[PDB]
Amino acid sequence: EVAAVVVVGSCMTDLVSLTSRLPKTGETIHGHKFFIGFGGKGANQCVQAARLGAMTSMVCKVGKDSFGNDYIENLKQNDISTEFTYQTKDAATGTASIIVNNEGQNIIVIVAGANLLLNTEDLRAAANVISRAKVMVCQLEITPATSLEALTMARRSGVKTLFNPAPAIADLDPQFYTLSDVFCCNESEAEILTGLTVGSAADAGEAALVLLKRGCQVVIITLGAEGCVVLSQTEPEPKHIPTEKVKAVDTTGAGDSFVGALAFYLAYYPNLSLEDMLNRSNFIAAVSVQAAGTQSSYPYKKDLPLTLFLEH
Amino acid sequence: EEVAAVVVVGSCMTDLVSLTSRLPKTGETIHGHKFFIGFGGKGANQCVQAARLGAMTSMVCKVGKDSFGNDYIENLKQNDISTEFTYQTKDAATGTASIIVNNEGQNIIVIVAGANLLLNTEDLRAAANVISRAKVMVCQLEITPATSLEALTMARRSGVKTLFNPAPAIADLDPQFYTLSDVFCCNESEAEILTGLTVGSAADAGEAALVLLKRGCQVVIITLGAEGCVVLSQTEPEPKHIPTEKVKAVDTTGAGDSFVGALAFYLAYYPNLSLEDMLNRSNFIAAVSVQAAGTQSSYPYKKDLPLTLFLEH
Ligand SMILES: Nc1ncnc2c1ncn2[C@@H]1O[C@H](COP(=O)(O)O)[C@@H](O)[C@H]1O
Ligand SMILES: Nc1ncnc2c1ncn2[C@@H]1O[C@H](COP(=O)(O)O)[C@@H](O)[C@H]1O
Ligand SMILES: [Cl-]
Numbered sequence: 001e002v003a004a005v006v007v008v009g010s011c012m013t014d015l016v017s018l019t020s021r022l023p024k025t026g027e028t029i030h031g032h033k034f035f036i037g038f039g040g041k042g043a044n045q046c047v048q049a050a051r052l053g054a055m056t057s058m059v060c061k062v063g064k065d066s067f068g069n070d071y072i073e074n075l076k077q078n079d080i081s082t083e084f085t086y087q088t089k090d091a092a093t094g095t096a097s098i099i100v101n102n103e104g105q106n107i108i109v110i111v112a113g114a115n116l117l118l119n120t121e122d123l124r125a126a127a128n129v130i131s132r133a134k135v136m137v138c139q140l141e142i143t144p145a146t147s148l149e150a151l152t153m154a155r156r157s158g159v160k161t162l163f164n165p166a167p168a169i170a171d172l173d174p175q176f177y178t179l180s181d182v183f184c185c186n187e188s189e190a191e192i193l194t195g196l197t198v199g200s201a202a203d204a205g206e207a208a209l210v211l212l213k214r215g216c217q218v219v220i221i222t223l224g225a226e227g228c229v230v231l232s233q234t235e236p237e238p239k240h241i242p243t244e245k246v247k248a249v250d251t252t253g254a255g256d257s258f259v260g261a262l263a264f265y266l267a268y269y270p271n272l273s274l275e276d277m278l279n280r281s282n283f284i285a286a287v288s289v290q291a292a293g294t295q296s297s298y299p300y301k302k303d304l305p306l307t308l309f310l311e312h
Numbered sequence: 313e314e315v316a317a318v319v320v321v322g323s324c325m326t327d328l329v330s331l332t333s334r335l336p337k338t339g340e341t342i343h344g345h346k347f348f349i350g351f352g353g354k355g356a357n358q359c360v361q362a363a364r365l366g367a368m369t370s371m372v373c374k375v376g377k378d379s380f381g382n383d384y385i386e387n388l389k390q391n392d393i394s395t396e397f398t399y400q401t402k403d404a405a406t407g408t409a410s411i412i413v414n415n416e417g418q419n420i421i422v423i424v425a426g427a428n429l430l431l432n433t434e435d436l437r438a439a440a441n442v443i444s445r446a447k448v449m450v451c452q453l454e455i456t457p458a459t460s461l462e463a464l465t466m467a468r469r470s471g472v473k474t475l476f477n478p479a480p481a482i483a484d485l486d487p488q489f490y491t492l493s494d495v496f497c498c499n500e501s502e503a504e505i506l507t508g509l510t511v512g513s514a515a516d517a518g519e520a521a522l523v524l525l526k527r528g529c530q531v532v533i534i535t536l537g538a539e540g541c542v543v544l545s546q547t548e549p550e551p552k553h554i555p556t557e558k559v560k561a562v563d564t565t566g567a568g569d570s571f572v573g574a575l576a577f578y579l580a581y582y583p584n585l586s587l588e589d590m591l592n593r594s595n596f597i598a599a600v601s602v603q604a605a606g607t608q609s610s611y612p613y614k615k616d617l618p619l620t621l622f623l624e625h
């Protein structure tokens with residue numbers, strides 16, 4: 001089947017060691033638990049959309065190494081097309097090595113790896129899939145130039161663009177904004193992007209407006225527990241969409257659950273209002289927040305209320 | 313076809329190595345510039361070196377039923393090591409060593425033993441016929457102490473020479489580890505932990521070695537990085553220093569394991585060399601490993617070494 005949602009972006013393998021204390025320079029320490037997790041903002045977004053029922057295609061680059069083979073199998077296991085998941089001998093699969101002590105303090109070492117080698121030729125080979133999609137989703141864990149090209153290829157075929165500038169970059173190219181039909185980020189990303197302080201939903205509306213003035217059609221800033229705030233060119237007044245309090249268990253990758261869900265709605269429920277989409281998206285993300293383990297916490301359609309999948 | 317003359321009961325671990333500009337401070341997320349996966353664990357390293365010199369080896373160990381463990385078995389097989397008693401378990405992940413290295417080669421290392429801790433007495437018992445035909449058993453401390461102790465007893469009772477490497481070392485090690493060791497081999501910092509003494513010299517090491525010898529080892533060897541090693545025996549208790557040639561070290565990681573795996577090779581295949589001789593050859597082989605990167609990848613093959621290392625008494 002033709003994929004409605006195409007995600008051009010990152011896969012990363014989380015390599016997590018639990019220890020009683022963090023090591024000092026020169027020290028070997030014995031930890032008490034290791035585990036592997038599937039991450040990367042692209043793949044996370046793609047998985048959430050897929051689990052809600054989207055036909056997706058993941059365009060990305062991993063290693064020709066075990067991590068990369070295992071990533072491919074995780075995508076397939078989630079019913080994501082891996083036709084343009086490239087494997088390269090030139091770098092390892094992206095990694096995040098995470099050490100956490102008994103106090104919850106951590107050290108993280110990220111090696112973007114093969115994700116940085118995804119390039120223009122790769123995306124051109126994927127032109128069929130990109131052109132026939134309804135939504136293209138991009139972030140900033142691959143080369144910026146590659147994301148920019150993906151956005152451009154989407155615009156030239158009339159595909160809707162959902163851009164998530166995460167992690168944020170202070171001097172982001174002005175074209176990112178003009179190429180973004182929907183531009184979605186969090187509070188600390190907005191601060192980096194605009195130079196402002198965002199300690200309130202009001203402060204966020206002001207940062208959102210700056211971003212909107214740079215040429216995004218729609219700007220959405222996520223606000224953790226506080227839900228999100230939205231503006232558009234047609235409706236420039238910031239509208240706050242709260243989300244009902246829940247007992248958060250692990251909020252890791254909540255933003256990716258949100259974005260993936262938004263991608264799902266944009267592609268499959270185009271006639272919902274934007275306000276409506278963002279409620280459903282907030283809800284789905286809030287579900288992810290109540291279980292551990294990032295992708296493993298992303299709900300499937302069958303475990304969610306049927307109301308999220310009807311009109312009204 | 314061929315009987316394994318060297319049996320190694322011990323650890324496999326997957327090395328997960330991130331190169332960075334600086335080591336991360338508490339709470340910090342940093343970006344590194346390179347990631348490598350490697351095959352480690354003191355047992356497997358020892359075994360690989362012996363195998364590459366020509367020994368028929370058998371690796372007794374436990375890894376996960378996971379990708380790391382399937383990859384580890386393929387590494388062993390690729391090095392011509394028997395994996396008949398390399399067990400795989402659903403109950404834990406393959407052991408890991410998560411390593412961050414900065415531009416200066418300083419590091420932080422987090423080891424998670426994982427499946428290596430589940431190697432148990434039933435697993436060893438199945439290996440009894442192999443142990444009984446071996447010439448040398450090699451153990452370390454990266455599996456359960458009790459499992460290593462049982463491997464050493466199973467070796468003794470079959471008349472198989474025991475080569476014990478108490479690494480990582482621990483204060484107040486069971487007295488039986490010494491009495492069950494025909495050859496007991498460790499480095500300077502291990503010797504300090506084991507004896508409570510300070511070893512900042514080859515002379516200091518001889519004194520630590522003597523303590524260790526008094527606890528009942530037949531032969532004690534302490535490795536001394538660039539200084540080579542020092543040896544004592546019950547029959548010859550005077551410490552003998554064996555130096556080794558200044559070479560330009562590129563990466564000394566796993567050099568000790570190269571040294572031990574070579575020694576294991578000699579004990580098994582050249583039993584009539586003098587001990588002094590064995591330790592020159594071993595020093596040399598370990599010194600070659602130090603001139604290339606990547607632990608097992610730096611361990612030389614017999615065909616790439618001077619033919620003089622393979623001649624008899
Ligand atoms: N503590 C929380 N309680 C309920 N929902 C949350 C919480 N944190 C995040 N979310 C949801 O997931 C998204 C992730 O937002 P952020 O925390 O800005 O990455 C939010 O916009 C909410 O929809
Ligand atoms: N810089 C070096 N030059 C030559 N040989 C070395 C060097 N570092 C380690 N080795 C060899 O590997 C053994 C193990 O060293 P150590 O890690 O100190 O136990 C030594 O006994 C030497 O045979
Ligand atoms: Cl400790």
Ligand code: NA
Nearest residue numbers: 166186255256
């Ligand atoms: Na985010």
Ligand code: NA
Nearest residue numbers: 250288291297
């Ligand atoms: Na979660």
Ligand code: NA
Nearest residue numbers: 479499568569
């Ligand atoms: Na050692």
Ligand code: NA
Nearest residue numbers: 563601604610
């Ligand atoms: Na080396």
